[PDB]
Write a protein that binds this DNA or RNA. Structure first.
Length: 115
DNA sequence: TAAAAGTAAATATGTTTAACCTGACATTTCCG
DNA sequence: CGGAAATGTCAGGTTAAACATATTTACTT
């Protein structure tokens, strides 16, 4: 449905946000630790596990920049290049850089197509 | 004048892996 | 045509996650 990019974190970020070690939620994810995981919305997208405290955030709306580039017929680094070199071209295009992975949303890819 | 020792699970640490962005540059497309 | 903007190549570097192993906690005997 909808997603608030101000409320999403990597596993490492959310781990330190809840006061645990950098690898806490990754270990919980890998070892199926439901007692920990059940408190969060999470989903591994590309090489990043996205976490949110807000259960109303539909993380399946996130698409990696490489996936978005391919959906437009472009080279794999298409959106990474716009983000890094021509960021005015992303104004009004929801996106979030999380460190290993740059993300757009399904909705903001549609807005970009129209542009 | 309880403590020590054992323990399995939880949590943390160090090291490596794979994602995929970065960065310099090349080439193609747009539009006067 | 011609310059500018858009989009492409690819090695390599930086990152979060994975992995392997150790330490700490919580608890019992």
């Amino acid at each position: 449905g909808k997603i608030n990019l101000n409320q999403i974190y990597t596993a490492k970020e959310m781990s330190e946000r809840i006061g645990k070690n950098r690898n806490y939620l990754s270990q919980a994810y890998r070892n199926n630790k439901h007692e920990i995981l059940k408190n969060f919305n999470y989903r591994k997208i590309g090489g990043t596990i996205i976490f949110s405290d807000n259960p109303n955030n539909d993380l399946s709306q996130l698409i990696t920049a490489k996936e978005a580039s391919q959906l437009l017929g472009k080279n794999d680094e298409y959106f990474a290049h716009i983000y890094k070199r021509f960021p005015h071209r992303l104004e009004g295009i929801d996106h979030i850089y999380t460190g290993k992975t740059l993300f757009l949303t399904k909705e903001s890819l549609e807005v970009f197509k129209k542009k």
